[PDB]
Amino acid sequence: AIPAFHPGELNVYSAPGDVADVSRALRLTGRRVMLVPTMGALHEGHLALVRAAKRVPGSVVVVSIFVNPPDDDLAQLRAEGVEIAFTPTTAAMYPDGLRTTVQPGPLAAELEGGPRPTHFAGVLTVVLKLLQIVRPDRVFFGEKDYQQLVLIRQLVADFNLDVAVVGVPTVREADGLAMSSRNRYLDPAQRAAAVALSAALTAAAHAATAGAQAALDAARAVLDAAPGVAVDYLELRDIGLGPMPLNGSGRLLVAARLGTTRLLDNIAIEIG
Amino acid sequence: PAFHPGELNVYSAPGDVADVSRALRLTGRRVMLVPTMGALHEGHLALVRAAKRVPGSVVVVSIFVNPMQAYPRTPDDDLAQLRAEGVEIAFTPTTAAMYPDGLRTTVQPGPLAAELEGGPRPTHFAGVLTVVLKLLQIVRPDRVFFGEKDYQQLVLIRQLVADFNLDVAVVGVPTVREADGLAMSSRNRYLDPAQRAAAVALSAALTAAAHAATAGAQAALDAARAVLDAAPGVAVDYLELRDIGLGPMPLNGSGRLLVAARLGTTRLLDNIAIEIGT
Ligand SMILES: COc1ccc2c(c1)cc(C(=O)NS(=O)(=O)c1ccc(C(C)(C)C)cc1)n2CC(=O)O
Ligand SMILES: COc1ccc2c(c1)cc(C(=O)NS(=O)(=O)c1ccc(C(C)(C)C)cc1)n2CC(=O)O
């Protein structure tokens, strides 16, 4: 007895079982199930994850809202033509507490996994679960938190998961600042200083025709031009986060403390 | 990829078996997984036979020696019995295909994996759960079949499925045992005449405790230990009485008795359902 699903309206489900049944029922009848996993507090970035998912012909869009340890968000999705919001409780995602989890590979130890050693294990575990519950054809992440997205690609390859992982370019303020829920915490000076991350990164990207060293130095110069910006790391890696090849396509990642607030950004880089 | 119905189809590439699996499924067939490490015996034939009796089922036996958790490797004998029981899919991946990037993303079992068999082998179950998961993801069966010999393993798998929300049913199958009670095992070939004989004491001891249990837990345990002690060259690694789910939950009326012993080199496991009272 398949749960009630009204096509073209916004259907909300809090029971995993329900969303799993609705979702399985929709695949069987043509629809391609797109998942956009969020933690609520939805901003334009999210919206651009949703929009991409709808571009896929015949798709139905699942947006989970789960706080991984408000009707305004439901309003945005309804106003976006989202047909499913999956809104489970913590006891429902975790009816037996933390038991079996995912152990990410060694890349979880670096970069962000320095300041936060266990964070990614948590991310990968909830992502596997959501992928299992919803079983989408495709799953949509912003490129902002880039390390996270790569580990997710590693989760999918490593466990032979059947989903396609789509990374959507990061949505930014007018001045380049990568969108983030933390942005509303920076006072004006900090907010104005924050502009340096993306400006460092864009500078690097364009400086890159002169090669690897000039990209890093361009970005480091820009970072240096800003007060109150404590850079935890600034690193050029290959697209999958191993060492940067002598020439080819890579990624440049930055992370920084503006007061209490930790900011991240990253960009694509071609060397030559 | 080709699928000849009513015969045995042997696929090497995960992709090959995932496509055929999915294809058969949409056309209404129900997919049954029997995960083996090969060297098939009468217990494996039971797993298959249970799988077969699920209506409109197609049966996939996987044969993979997962180097993450020495072993007898006998595919001709293995595949011969398979078409005899009328199995339609054998999945036989290479290590290359299963682990192209090596050990990377893995499964971390809960605390039950550090107990019992996990104490001296603390990365053993992570290996088991990892490859089981890979195998459920490759083949996407409706049900999956395990014998009950390796009981902790079964419970842990029930956990993998619950905690990761895998939509598959775990079917446990009663241990198939030799005429004298000895639990079927690939490790049995490794017992000489003296040891084969002594080995009967494991199943002997458990069935004695099943029956002494009317007198309580302490009597079931004492019974079972007495039989183990009266046995020549049987060194008991552990004998424990637990909840059926084996977990941080006390014993009440029903439970599970588990034993691990060594016959020289060869380590044996057995376990039994137990009712206290009853
Ligand atoms: C494509 O444009 C963007 C730009 C930034 C984005 C996003 C999209 C999406 C996010 C985001 O979802 N951040 S988050 O803290 O809500 C979040 C939500 C869900 C996860 C998991 C557990 C599903 C991986 C991680 C982070 N964020 C960062 C943020 O909103 O804090
Ligand atoms: C219902 O009858 C029985 C009785 C005993 C059984 C079995 C069935 C199955 C096994 C068994 O261990 N088979 S296995 O060694 O090939 C095997 C296969 C696959 C796993 C994984 C994939 C779950 C890790 C473990 C063991 N065994 C025990 C054994 O062969 O040692």
Residue numbers in the entry:
A (entry chain B): 2 to 70, 86 to 288
B (entry chain A): 4 to 72, 81 to 289
Task: Quote the paper.
Herein, we describe the use of GE to optimize a fragment‐derived inhibitor of Mycobacterium tuberculosis pantothenate synthetase, an attractive target for developing new drugs against tuberculosis.
Based on these observations, the initial optimization strategy was focused on replacement of the methyl pyridine and the benzofuran groups rather than the acyl sulfonamide linker in both compounds 5 and 8. Compounds were designed with the objective of optimizing interactions at the P1 or P2 sites of panthothenate synthetase.
